[PDB]
Amino acid sequence: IKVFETREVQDLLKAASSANSTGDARTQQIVLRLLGDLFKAIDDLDITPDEVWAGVNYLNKLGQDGEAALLAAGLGLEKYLDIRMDAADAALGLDGGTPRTIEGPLYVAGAPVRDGVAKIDLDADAGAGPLVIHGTVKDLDGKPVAGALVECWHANSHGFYSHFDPTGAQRDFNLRGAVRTGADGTYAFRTLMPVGYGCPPQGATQQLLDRLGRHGNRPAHVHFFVTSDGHRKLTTQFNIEGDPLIWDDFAYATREELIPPVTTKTGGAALGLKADAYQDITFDFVLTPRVADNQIVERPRASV
Amino acid sequence: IKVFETREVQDLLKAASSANASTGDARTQQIVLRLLGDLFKAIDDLDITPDEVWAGVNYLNKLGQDGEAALLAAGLGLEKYLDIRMDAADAALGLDGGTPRTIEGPLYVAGAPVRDGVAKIDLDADAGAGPLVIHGTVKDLDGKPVAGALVECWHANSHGFYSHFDPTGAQRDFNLRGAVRTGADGTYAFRTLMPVGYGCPPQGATQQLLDRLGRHGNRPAHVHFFVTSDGHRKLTTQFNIEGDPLIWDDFAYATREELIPPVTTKTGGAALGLKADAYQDITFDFVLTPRVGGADNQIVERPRASV
Numbered sequence A: 001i002k003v004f005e006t007r008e009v010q011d012l013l014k015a016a017s018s019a020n021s022t023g024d025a026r027t028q029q030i031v032l033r034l035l036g037d038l039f040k041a042i043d044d045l046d047i048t049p050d051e052v053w054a055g056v057n058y059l060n061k062l063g064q065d066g067e068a069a070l071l072a073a074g075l076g077l078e079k080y081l082d083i084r085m086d087a088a089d090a091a092l093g094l095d096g097g098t099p100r101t102i103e104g105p106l107y108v109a110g111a112p113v114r115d116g117v118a119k120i121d122l123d124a125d126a127g128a129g130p131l132v133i134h135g136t137v138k139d140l141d142g143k144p145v146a147g148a149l150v151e152c153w154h155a156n157s158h159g160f161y162s163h164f165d166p167t168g169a170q171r172d173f174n175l176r177g178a179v180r181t182g183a184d185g186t187y188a189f190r191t192l193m194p195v196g197y198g199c200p201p202q203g204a205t206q207q208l209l210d211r212l213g214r215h216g217n218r219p220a221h222v223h224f225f226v227t228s229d230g231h232r233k234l235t236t237q238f239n240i241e242g243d244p245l246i247w248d249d250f251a252y253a254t255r256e257e258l259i260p261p262v263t264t265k266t267g268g269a270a271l272g273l274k275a276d277a278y279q280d281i282t283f284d285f286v287l288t289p290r291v292a293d294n295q296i297v298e299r300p301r302a303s304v
Numbered sequence B: 001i002k003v004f005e006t007r008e009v010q011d012l013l014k015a016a017s018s019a020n021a022s023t024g025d026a027r028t029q030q031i032v033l034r035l036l037g038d039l040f041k042a043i044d045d046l047d048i049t050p051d052e053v054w055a056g057v058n059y060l061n062k063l064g065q066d067g068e069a070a071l072l073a074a075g076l077g078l079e080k081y082l083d084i085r086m087d088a089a090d091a092a093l094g095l096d097g098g099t100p101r102t103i104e105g106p107l108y109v110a111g112a113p114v115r116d117g118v119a120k121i122d123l124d125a126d127a128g129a130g131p132l133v134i135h136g137t138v139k140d141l142d143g144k145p146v147a148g149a150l151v152e153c154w155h156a157n158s159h160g161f162y163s164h165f166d167p168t169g170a171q172r173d174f175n176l177r178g179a180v181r182t183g184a185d186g187t188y189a190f191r192t193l194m195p196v197g198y199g200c201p202p203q204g205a206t207q208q209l210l211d212r213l214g215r216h217g218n219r220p221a222h223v224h225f226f227v228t229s230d231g232h233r234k235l236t237t238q239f240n241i242e243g244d245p246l247i248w249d250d251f252a253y254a255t256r257e258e259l260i261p262p263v264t265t266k267t268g269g270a271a272l273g274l275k276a277d278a279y280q281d282i283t284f285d286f287v288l289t290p291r292v293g294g295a296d297n298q299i300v301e302r303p304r305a306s307v
């Protein structure tokens, strides 16, 4: 049985997506398209009322859990946005900088900004060894970028982020920091080694992933923003070398270029670290110039 | 710029919708693959920006936090669409001539009092609502009265609020909710008060999106019914109160020409246990369809409140 092409369905689609205020034309356009696509899929796949109401109930749970942005990551929609942004840059030759990858839903605004270097582990974590991340911010010609704002955030040894830790064990901005580069363009973060993240086991995202036969885990990783006057804003990450989930990220974010080598070094005491032996990661950023920033993204983000 | 047909996007879609030790539910994988693929293609076709996507993601969070996803299903015509598909299936099977179905809406409550033949279902005083008597017969497709049918009724008060969903807390359990079991003559009657039309919660996610579309979130005054009977399919329907100005402008698209019975003012209300001599009277008949193959091929399972 197929009804999508009937006049009644077409009229219903038009009424539901248009004004009886005149409304927002762009919202009307997008709703018409998405509602029409949904109706056609229901027609094509013979999706039953019971199935629709189960999906409607799932949307209630998803929003109740506050997890719609987590599901956006888990279904590859967030990665898809990067694919489209990558293709846009390639058409304009705005590639060759450090590659972007997904932001994820766990950024928090307001971390204290330091000149040159920041120590960002505030809470003791006996399951996480000391880690130093350092490098240079440069332009496409290799010249250092001064005054760039490099922001970092990552998880603790239980896979939890500050401001999102269900045990309440972390202080504000634990494992979150911002460095303002000086004239030499260099940055360094002094922190602890992250462990991979997993979706809240009872949450809506994991519920649907379970139905798909999929896990909800990420490899260990570290997030970055880089903001600089005259350069486009970089959103990226890198993964911790050797993680078994490195090519099995439930958020599809891993890139071969974003897996820097990890090396063990000594002398941690002189760098203010909690142990003599520590892990060291060199990671350089290459920024691209503006045109106006045609790829910066505005989305809801936590703050304190 | 269009990327949907690239190998990378196609591989991403297949990975996101399929299993990685556990094998998953094939039907869920099938539906996710289709809906996710359609979403990716619409984003490509309409050049939907990251900012727009994240605003939509944020709206889904608000929708579920408000517990309004089923209200939006009604307001965007998805609930009506399900009835259109059920109607076409019935027409293909020759299940015609019954009372037309229409949408359930999200405000049913299980457990209301059941009486034989007649029920007075207004429990809370409501000075803004006059007495209303709804009566008729339940019949089959041969015009024969159906005995033992369960006719369930629920509707709003003069503020447009339903019991168990009244944010002022002013209504007791099962106010304006009740069920009548027909006798041998197939007759039912409800004694109640006149409903007023419903409006979406003004601060809720459903009204927020309706506002962006330039649309109101109001329903005309109406009364809901379930009718259940051994050997007949479960009827979900309503009727609208004649003369309501919103009667053909329901934000949930539920009005049908056959479901607008005439309203007549009558006297003698005291003898019917009513609060006034003058009352409004509505004759409304139900015609049921048979349960072919012993199975009800259109009964719907969805979350429903209870007490």
Ligand SMILES: CCCCCCCCCCCCCCCCCCCC(=O)O[C@H](COC(=O)CCCCCCCCCCCCCC)COP(=O)(O)OCCN
Pocket: A033, A034, A035, A037, A038, A047, A050, A051, A052, A053, A054, A055, A056, A058, A059, A208, A211, B027, B028, B031, B032, B035, B036, B038, B039, B040, B042
């Ligand atoms: C271009 C436009 C395309 C549409 C755009 C819509 C918005 C974006 C959508 C992105 C694509 C992904 C959609 C994913 C929907 C997942 C729904 C899962 C529901 C679910 O778990 O159902 C179980 C039964 O399964 C079943 O019944 C099988 C699955 C049936 C799912 C039907 C969904 C239809 C759509 C209805 C909502 C509208 C869209 C929602 C995203 C519940 O059952 P349980 O009780 O046993 O266990 C759970 C405990 N209660």
Ligand SMILES: CCCCCCCCCCCCCCCCCCCC(=O)O[C@H](COC(=O)CCCCCCCCCCCCCC)COP(=O)(O)OCCN
Pocket: A026, A027, A030, A031, A034, A035, A036, A038, A056, A059, A068, A071, A072, A075, A077, A298, A299, A300, B048, B051, B052, B053, B054, B055, B056, B057, B058, B059, B060, B063, B068, B069, B070, B072, B073, B074, B076, B078, B208, B209, B212
């Ligand atoms: C409920 C169950 C029953 C119905 C299910 C139907 C599902 C699909 C069928 C059609 C319905 C489409 C629904 C679209 C929802 C979002 C639209 C309104 C969002 C909104 O108010 O955005 C405004 C801006 O508009 C804009 O920016 C315009 C663009 C917004 C639309 C983009 C949609 C993208 C897809 C997202 C869903 C999939 C993700 C999860 C798989 C205000 O926002 P603001 O300016 O105040 O900003 C704050 C956030 N930053």
Ligand SMILES: [Cl-]
Pocket: B115
């Ligand atoms: Cl009684």
Ligand SMILES: [Cl-]
Pocket: B201, B202, B203, B204
């Ligand atoms: Cl409200």
Ligand SMILES: [Mg+2]
Pocket: B097
């Ligand atoms: Mg007839």
Ligand SMILES: [Zn+2]
Pocket: A104, A106, A154, A197, A221, A223
């Ligand atoms: Zn992360």
Ligand SMILES: [Zn+2]
Pocket: B105, B107, B155, B198, B222, B224
């Ligand atoms: Zn109603």
